[PDB]
Design a protein around this motif. Structure first.
Motif, PDB file in Angstrom:
ATOM      1  N   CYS A  88       0.832  -1.196   0.000  1.00  0.00           N
ATOM      2  CA  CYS A  88       0.000   0.000   0.000  1.00  0.00           C
ATOM      3  C   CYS A  88       0.866   1.245   0.000  1.00  0.00           C
ATOM      4  O   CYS A  88       1.850   1.322   0.740  1.00  0.00           O
ATOM      5  N   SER A  89       0.501   2.219  -0.833  1.00  0.00           N
ATOM      6  CA  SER A  89       1.244   3.473  -0.904  1.00  0.00           C
ATOM      7  C   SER A  89       1.205   4.154   0.463  1.00  0.00           C
ATOM      8  O   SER A  89       0.318   3.891   1.267  1.00  0.00           O
ATOM      9  N   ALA A  90       2.162   5.033   0.725  1.00  0.00           N
ATOM     10  CA  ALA A  90       2.205   5.721   2.009  1.00  0.00           C
ATOM     11  C   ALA A  90       0.861   6.348   2.410  1.00  0.00           C
ATOM     12  O   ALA A  90       0.511   6.356   3.592  1.00  0.00           O
ATOM     13  N   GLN A  91       0.106   6.856   1.435  1.00  0.00           N
ATOM     14  CA  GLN A  91      -1.197   7.474   1.713  1.00  0.00           C
ATOM     15  C   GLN A  91      -2.215   6.525   2.331  1.00  0.00           C
ATOM     16  O   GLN A  91      -2.784   6.811   3.385  1.00  0.00           O
ATOM     17  N   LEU A  92      -2.451   5.407   1.650  1.00  0.00           N
ATOM     18  CA  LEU A  92      -3.406   4.400   2.093  1.00  0.00           C
ATOM     19  C   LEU A  92      -3.037   3.837   3.453  1.00  0.00           C
ATOM     20  O   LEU A  92      -3.911   3.621   4.301  1.00  0.00           O
ATOM     21  N   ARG A  93      -1.746   3.598   3.663  1.00  0.00           N
ATOM     22  CA  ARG A  93      -1.271   3.061   4.935  1.00  0.00           C
ATOM     23  C   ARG A  93      -1.634   3.976   6.095  1.00  0.00           C
ATOM     24  O   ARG A  93      -1.920   3.505   7.190  1.00  0.00           O
ATOM     25  N   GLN A  94      -1.608   5.282   5.856  1.00  0.00           N
ATOM     26  CA  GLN A  94      -1.947   6.227   6.905  1.00  0.00           C
ATOM     27  C   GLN A  94      -3.441   6.185   7.161  1.00  0.00           C
ATOM     28  O   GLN A  94      -3.900   6.461   8.267  1.00  0.00           O
ATOM     29  N   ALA A  95      -4.198   5.821   6.134  1.00  0.00           N
ATOM     30  CA  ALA A  95      -5.644   5.706   6.258  1.00  0.00           C
ATOM     31  C   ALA A  95      -5.980   4.386   6.957  1.00  0.00           C
ATOM     32  O   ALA A  95      -6.774   4.356   7.886  1.00  0.00           O
ATOM     33  N   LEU A  96      -5.354   3.300   6.518  1.00  0.00           N
ATOM     34  CA  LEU A  96      -5.633   2.006   7.095  1.00  0.00           C
ATOM     35  C   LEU A  96      -5.079   1.820   8.492  1.00  0.00           C
ATOM     36  O   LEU A  96      -5.601   1.000   9.266  1.00  0.00           O
ATOM     37  N   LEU A  97      -4.039   2.572   8.838  1.00  0.00           N
ATOM     38  CA  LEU A  97      -3.431   2.404  10.148  1.00  0.00           C
ATOM     39  C   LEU A  97      -3.735   3.514  11.133  1.00  0.00           C
ATOM     40  O   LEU A  97      -3.413   3.400  12.310  1.00  0.00           O
ATOM     41  N   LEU A  98      -4.384   4.573  10.674  1.00  0.00           N
ATOM     42  CA  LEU A  98      -4.682   5.664  11.572  1.00  0.00           C
ATOM     43  C   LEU A  98      -5.927   6.496  11.240  1.00  0.00           C
ATOM     44  O   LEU A  98      -6.944   6.409  11.928  1.00  0.00           O
ATOM     45  N   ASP A  99      -5.826   7.321  10.199  1.00  0.00           N
ATOM     46  CA  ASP A  99      -6.908   8.207   9.781  1.00  0.00           C
ATOM     47  C   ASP A  99      -8.303   7.625   9.889  1.00  0.00           C
ATOM     48  O   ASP A  99      -9.099   8.101  10.695  1.00  0.00           O
ATOM     49  N   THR A 100      -8.600   6.608   9.090  1.00  0.00           N
ATOM     50  CA  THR A 100      -9.909   5.982   9.146  1.00  0.00           C
ATOM     51  C   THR A 100     -10.315   5.536  10.545  1.00  0.00           C
ATOM     52  O   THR A 100     -11.286   6.035  11.092  1.00  0.00           O
ATOM     53  N   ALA A 101      -9.586   4.603  11.137  1.00  0.00           N
ATOM     54  CA  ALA A 101      -9.977   4.149  12.457  1.00  0.00           C
ATOM     55  C   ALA A 101     -10.092   5.305  13.434  1.00  0.00           C
ATOM     56  O   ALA A 101     -10.944   5.283  14.321  1.00  0.00           O
TER      57      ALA A 101
END
Length: 273
Positions: free
Chosen positions: A251-264
């Motif tokens: 996963c690109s750096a963007q998605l990873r920040q979403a999947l590991l932080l932002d979203t949750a």
């Protein structure tokens, strides 16, 4: 303390408690808060979500006791009995629980649109709590469309629990990539080792699934879970082997920040910064 990354979906339970209160389904080893907290810091993640483990049913005492033990650090979701009063839901939200999990998987199909469930569905709605689903992808679109009217957040477990060796056009996953979710539908990307396939097949499908999923729901709707202690797969999976599979998705750096932080961080309100 520092909100570095958030693990959504995880279980904790004491072997001494599973022996003192006498349980027999899937209780053998011990998954104390300490161990989970350790595994978390050891892999980055600083915050996590304790989900009620199935074999405990409505008894959310351990989950509730662990939430207060480490205030702010965790949120966790529970399982509620058919008819429950707002009083206890408020006191729970005050403790940190932000959702309810019906958790069917291997259980009899419930009729959410029915009247024997509405009494509870309304209670969680007035609290703003989301509803977590866990069942074959084949039944997901039906359960989602049933909870659809109630106007509440719907969280789908493990990619929707589709069949890794079946493709994206699967009987249930297809409707999922075309579902009518007014941004009120969340999907958890976790436990790929549950896709009924080989560690190499699930991983290949988890890869395709992610790209298709995010393309229809968006990064702000996908979050990563460890699913620790990984029940029925303790021998094969560990927190580290789970992260390693995440890193593998590529996963690109963007998605990873979403999947590991932002979203949750949004769904569970981890307003710390």
């Amino acid at each position: 303390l520092h909100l570095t990354a958030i693990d959504s979906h995880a279980h904790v339970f004491s072997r001494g408690l599973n022996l003192a209160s006498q349980r027999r389904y899937a209780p053998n080893y011990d998954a104390p808060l300490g161990d989970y907290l350790g595994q978390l810091r050891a892999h980055g993640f600083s915050h996590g979500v304790l989900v009620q483990p199935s074999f405990l049913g409505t008894d959310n005492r351990y989950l509730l006791s662990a939430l207060q033990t480490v205030p702010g650090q965790l949120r966790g979701v529970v399982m509620l009995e058919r008819d429950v009063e707002q009083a206890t839901l408020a006191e729970m939200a005050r403790l940190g629980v932000r959702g309810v999990r019906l958790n069917l998987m291997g259980q009899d199909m419930p009729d959410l649109t029915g009247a024997q469930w509405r009494p509870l569905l309304e209670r969680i709605g007035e609290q703003g709590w989301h509803v977590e689903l866990h069942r074959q992808v084949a039944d997901i679109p039906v359960l989602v469309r049933a909870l659809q009217p109630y106007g509440l957040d719907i969280v789908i477990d493990h990619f929707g629990r589709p069949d890794a060796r079946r493709g994206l056009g699967q009987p249930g996953f297809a409707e999922l990539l075309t579902l009518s979710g007014r941004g009120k539908v969340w999907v958890k990307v976790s436990g790929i080792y549950r896709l009924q396939g080989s560690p190499e097949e699930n991983l290949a499908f988890a890869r395709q699934a992610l790209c298709a999923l995010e393309a229809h729901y968006g990064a702000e709707r996908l979050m990563w879970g460890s699913d620790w202690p990984h029940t029925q797969h303790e021998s094969e999976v560990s927190f580290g082997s789970a992260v390693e599979q995440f890193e593998a998705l590529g996963c690109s750096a963007q998605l990873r920040q979403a999947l590991l932080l932002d979203t949750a961080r949004a769904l569970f309100g981890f307003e710390l910064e």
